[PDB]
Scaffold this active site. Structure first.
Site, PDB file in Angstrom:
ATOM      1  N   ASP A   1      -0.892  -7.128   2.271  1.00  6.99           N
ATOM      2  CA  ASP A   1      -0.205  -5.841   2.309  1.00  6.99           C
ATOM      3  C   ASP A   1       1.303  -6.039   2.492  1.00  6.99           C
ATOM      4  O   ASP A   1       1.886  -5.673   3.524  1.00  6.99           O
ATOM      5  CB  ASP A   1      -0.774  -4.989   3.443  1.00  6.99           C
TER       6      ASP A   1
ATOM      7  N   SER B   1       3.911   2.928   8.546  1.00  6.91           N
ATOM      8  CA  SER B   1       3.464   1.870   7.654  1.00  6.91           C
ATOM      9  C   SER B   1       4.616   1.375   6.800  1.00  6.91           C
ATOM     10  O   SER B   1       5.462   2.160   6.386  1.00  6.91           O
ATOM     11  CB  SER B   1       2.310   2.374   6.787  1.00  6.91           C
ATOM     12  N   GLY B   2       4.637   0.070   6.539  1.00  8.17           N
ATOM     13  CA  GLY B   2       5.716  -0.525   5.773  1.00  8.17           C
ATOM     14  C   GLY B   2       6.836  -0.868   6.745  1.00  8.17           C
ATOM     15  O   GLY B   2       7.614  -1.797   6.531  1.00  8.17           O
TER      16      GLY B   2
ATOM     17  N   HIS C   1       0.797  -1.229   0.000  1.00  5.11           N
ATOM     18  CA  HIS C   1       0.000   0.000   0.000  1.00  5.11           C
ATOM     19  C   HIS C   1       0.823   1.269   0.000  1.00  5.11           C
ATOM     20  O   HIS C   1       0.327   2.333  -0.377  1.00  5.11           O
ATOM     21  CB  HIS C   1      -1.000   0.003   1.175  1.00  5.11           C
TER      22      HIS C   1
HETATM   23  N1  4PP Z   1      -2.768   2.554  14.691  1.00  4.69           N
HETATM   24  C1  4PP Z   1      -1.955   1.924  13.867  1.00  4.69           C
HETATM   25  N2  4PP Z   1      -1.333   0.828  14.260  1.00  4.69           N
HETATM   26  C2  4PP Z   1      -1.751   2.478  12.444  1.00  4.69           C
HETATM   27  C3  4PP Z   1      -0.574   2.183  11.699  1.00  4.69           C
HETATM   28  C4  4PP Z   1      -0.413   2.711  10.383  1.00  4.69           C
HETATM   29  C5  4PP Z   1      -1.430   3.533   9.815  1.00  4.69           C
HETATM   30  C6  4PP Z   1      -2.612   3.826  10.567  1.00  4.69           C
HETATM   31  C7  4PP Z   1      -3.744   4.716   9.982  1.00  4.69           C
HETATM   32  C8  4PP Z   1      -4.527   5.550  10.849  1.00  4.69           C
HETATM   33  C9  4PP Z   1      -5.568   6.361  10.320  1.00  4.69           C
HETATM   34  C10 4PP Z   1      -5.836   6.347   8.926  1.00  4.69           C
HETATM   35  C11 4PP Z   1      -5.068   5.524   8.052  1.00  4.69           C
HETATM   36  C12 4PP Z   1      -5.388   5.538   6.548  1.00  4.69           C
HETATM   37  C13 4PP Z   1      -5.347   4.124   5.962  1.00  4.69           C
HETATM   38  C14 4PP Z   1      -6.770   3.762   5.548  1.00  4.69           C
HETATM   39  C15 4PP Z   1      -6.881   2.253   5.362  1.00  4.69           C
HETATM   40  N3  4PP Z   1      -7.922   1.741   6.280  1.00  4.69           N
HETATM   41  C16 4PP Z   1      -8.126   0.273   6.159  1.00  4.69           C
HETATM   42  C17 4PP Z   1      -9.093  -0.338   6.983  1.00  4.69           C
HETATM   43  C18 4PP Z   1      -9.318  -1.728   6.905  1.00  4.69           C
HETATM   44  N4  4PP Z   1      -8.572  -2.504   5.996  1.00  4.69           N
HETATM   45  C19 4PP Z   1      -7.603  -1.896   5.165  1.00  4.69           C
HETATM   46  C20 4PP Z   1      -7.376  -0.515   5.241  1.00  4.69           C
HETATM   47  C21 4PP Z   1      -4.397   6.467   5.819  1.00  4.69           C
HETATM   48  O1  4PP Z   1      -3.288   5.958   5.199  1.00  4.69           O
HETATM   49  O2  4PP Z   1      -4.614   7.687   5.807  1.00  4.69           O
HETATM   50  C22 4PP Z   1      -4.016   4.705   8.580  1.00  4.69           C
HETATM   51  C23 4PP Z   1      -2.760   3.293  11.874  1.00  4.69           C
END
Ligand code: 4PP
Ligand code: CA
Lengths: 91, 235
Positions: free
Chosen positions: B88, B185-186, B42
């Site tokens: 992912d 992330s990643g 992602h």
């Molecule tokens: N707390 C953590 N451990 C964590 C870790 C990494 C990223 C996020 C996070 C927090 C808020 C919004 C987004 C979003 C990503 C939207 C994807 N949402 C989903 C939900 C269910 N399945 C797949 C994907 C963003 O990148 O803005 C990502 C939380």
């Protein structure tokens, strides 16, 4: 002190003074050879430094790439200055 | 990382940072070897172009030791799903080999069976990154780490408003304000066993950051160990 025969499971008792010593045979640990040698990974990871699996109802240790299984067959010896998973604690 | 602390000298060497065209981090990764970085698929859709910078401890300024590496090939998982973030996972082949040194070293890839029985069964794991220090705050200019307890599957599913597939797992606290966040992330999630750290997850997502009744969602690496094996042979 070996009189009382303190070594269990036919241990090699060696007398001294107010003490004695047990040399454990096959499949025994402990001061008196009363504990059972590593037969499962669930208990102490089988004494393995890293990977553990059981071969023939016995524990067999292994290591990750960049390491070599020591002679004792439990420890893992780095083959280089920067093996995986080791924090670089140098200073 | 919300809560937790900054990595101490030599503590988080396997940490990698995907920097965009502006040289700003937007995702993390784990050094798998001199030529390979583990990351989230992602993240591949969150930058026009990016490079992998290693050895960085403070994105604020150049303190030497850091090295940026260009990506030769991107190996994203075929079944990656943009809605659920299933699968992912992606591996990155670098054009030039990382030079393992202080604060730059790979994390061990464990054998699948053992990781499941002995790693995933540990009390906690460790997550790191330069992500958001708060659900809506700025990213950390300093590399941070956070110990996060492993969370049972049903407990995880129950607490999730979104689907938790077998390619994922939960880690973190119920209400304690500690968790990974956007920017991590990643990044790596590693489990320590006898002072040897093994990669166990990939920071994937989460409903917000350190939310009450919410946990951190990680890609379950044990489900992709063979895939990672084959991927690290590419190009
Ligand atoms: N707390 C953590 N451990 C964590 C870790 C990494 C990223 C996020 C996070 C927090 C808020 C919004 C987004 C979003 C990503 C939207 C994807 N949402 C989903 C939900 C269910 N399945 C797949 C994907 C963003 O990148 O803005 C990502 C939380
Ligand atoms: Ca810097």
């Amino acid at each position: 002190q070996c009189e009382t025969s303190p070594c269990q499971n036919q241990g090699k008792c060696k007398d001294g003074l107010g003490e004695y010593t047990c040399t454990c045979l096959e499949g025994f640990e402990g001061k008196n050879c009363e504990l059972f040698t590593r037969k499962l990974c669930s208990l102490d990871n089988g004494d393995c430094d890293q990977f553990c699996h059981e071969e023939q109802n016995s524990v067999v240790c292994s290591c990750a790439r960049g390491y070599t299984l020591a002679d004792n067959g439990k420890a893992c010896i780095p083959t280089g200055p920067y093996p995986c998973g080791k924090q670089t604690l140098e200073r | 990382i919300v809560g937790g602390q900054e990595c101490k000298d030599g503590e988080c060497p396997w940490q990698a940072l995907l920097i965009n065209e502006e040289n700003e981090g937007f995702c993390g990764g784990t050094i798998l070897s001199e030529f390979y970085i583990l990351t989230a698929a992602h993240c591949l859709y969150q930058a026009k172009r990016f490079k992998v910078r290693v050895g960085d401890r403070n994105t604020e300024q150049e303190e030497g030791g850091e090295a940026v590496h260009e990506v030769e090939v991107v190996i994203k998982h075929n079944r990656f799903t943009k809605e659920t973030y299933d699968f992912d996972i992606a591996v990155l082949r670098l054009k030039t080999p990382i030079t393992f040194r202080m604060n730059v070293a790979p994390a061990c890839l464990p054998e699948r069976d053992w990781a499941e029985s002995t790693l995933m069964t540990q009390k906690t794991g460790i997550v790191s990154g330069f992500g958001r220090t708060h659900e809506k705050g700025r990213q950390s200019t300093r590399l941070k780490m956070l110990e996060v307890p492993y969370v049972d599957r049903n407990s995880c599913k129950l607490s999730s408003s979104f689907i938790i597939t077998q390619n994922m797992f939960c880690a973190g606290y119920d209400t304690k304000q500690e968790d990974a966040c956007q920017g991590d992330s990643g990044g790596p999630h590693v489990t320590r066993f006898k002072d040897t750290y093994f990669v166990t997850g990939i920071v994937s997502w989460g409903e917000g950051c350190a939310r009450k009744g919410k946990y951190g969602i990680y890609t379950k690496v044990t489900a992709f160990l063979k895939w990672i094996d084959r991927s690290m042979k590419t190009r």
